[PDB]
């Protein structure tokens, strides 16, 4: 998931509608944003030991999340009826332009399928999940 904030985009974002929304909501677009990222470049970043976040990244999330908070509930832009938010063409707008998401690939370019091995953080959280116990406490 992100790390980021719903109080940073708008501090970022300059359309109203991102701001003038609420805390909740903001956050269920960013979650929903870097999902597109991910999907791009095919992997998450779940592993705790390799939640990589460079300047780059926290910018081309800050984009994407006001794009989607501005098409999320605007008073002139529609699906025509369709079901929750699509990552694909809708979204109308009042000058019949098809609102696109923001070329945000160049800065995840550089983190798109690396070439490493399976080094990564892998079997480590499986061992210690599905431990007997290891601890005085039982939650």
Do not use: C
């Amino acid at each position: 998931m992100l790390l980021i904030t719903p109080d940073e985009l708008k501090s970022y974002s300059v359309f109203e509608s991102v701001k003038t929304r609420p805390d909740e909501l903001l956050k269920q677009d960013i979650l929903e944003a870097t999902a597109d990222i991910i999907l791009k470049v095919g992997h998450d970043f779940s592993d705790a030991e390799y939640i990589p976040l460079p300047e780059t990244v926290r910018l081309a999330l800050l984009k994407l999340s006001q794009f989607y908070a501005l098409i999320n509930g605007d008073e002139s832009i529609i699906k025509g009826y369709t079901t929750e938010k699509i990552g694909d063409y809708s979204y109308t707008l009042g000058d019949g332009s098809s609102l696109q998401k923001p070329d945000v690939y160049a800065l995840i370019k550089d983190y798109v399928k690396p070439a490493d091995p399976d080094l990564e953080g892998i079997e480590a959280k499986v061992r210690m999940r599905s431990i007997l116990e290891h601890h005085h406490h039982h939650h």
